[PDB]
Design a protein around this ligand. Structure first.
Ligand SMILES: [Zn+2]
Length: 226
């Protein structure tokens, strides 16, 4: 049932229910030749929603808000971007215009600014060193160390044991690491092991791109990176 690039045109967004009060959002973007599918997360907290990652640019992020209003009907009040690439902060200006309080790690804000990308408005201050973890509403945000990028974060929803790995985690079908220009290939396996050790009871693991799986995606990622 999980949507792929073939099911979603650029500019549309689908939601997919993952567990109680947890959905992923899936969108499509085209970079020159390449067409990607990309996942974020939505998590209910009382009568509001926490959003993890934009839908890759302003147009998709507008469609994301519309689809949330249509399907869920609760307001997105806060967001977290999991790394500095346009794929995850592109659209933060749409979120700000809709009144969302946008957050990420201080390092992500710095890298986004350096890259000329959109910059979330607020910093999650206790996330500075590999291993740092903070609670934020109904999730934990974990900085496990450098991997796909130096700043990449993962997000865990403890009530339902759902781990959003973002682009630090590859889907089962993926056999190459993608854009490695900001990656730390040497550190990535150790970063994965840190995720494994922290969330040994996770039931679903959602990669940055492609099909959700279980904890097996973590070791798979290490194998690919090598
Ligand atoms: Zn990226």
């Amino acid at each position: 049932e999980y949507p792929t690039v073939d099911d979603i045109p650029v500019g549309e967004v689908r939601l997919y229910k993952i567990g109680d009060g947890v959905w992923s959002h899936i969108a499509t973007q085209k970079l020159g030749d390449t067409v990607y599918s990309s996942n974020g997360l939505i998590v209910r907290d009382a009568d509001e929603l926490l959003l993890i990652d934009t839908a890759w640019g302003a147009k998709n992020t507008v469609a994301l808000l519309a689809e949330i209003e249509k399907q869920i009907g609760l307001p997105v009040t806060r967001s977290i971007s999991t790394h500095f690439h346009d794929a995850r902060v592109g659209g933060v200006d749409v979120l700000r215009a809709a009144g969302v309080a946008t957050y990420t790690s201080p390092l992500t804000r710095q890298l986004a600014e350096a890259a000329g990308n959109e910059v979330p408005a607020h910093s999650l201050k206790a996330l500075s060193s590999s291993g740092d973890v903070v609670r934020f509403g109904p999730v934990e945000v974990f900085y496990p160390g450098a991997a796909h990028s130096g700043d990449n974060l993962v997000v865990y929803v403890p009530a339902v044991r759902v781990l959003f790995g973002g682009c630090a985690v590859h889907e089962a079908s993926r056999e190459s690491a993608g854009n490695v220009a900001d990656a730390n290939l040497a550190e990535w396996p150790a970063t994965i092991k840190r995720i494994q050790q922290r969330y040994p009871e996770a039931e679903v693991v959602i990669p940055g791109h492609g099909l959700p799986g279980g904890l097996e995606l973590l070791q798979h990622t290490t194998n690919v990176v090598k």
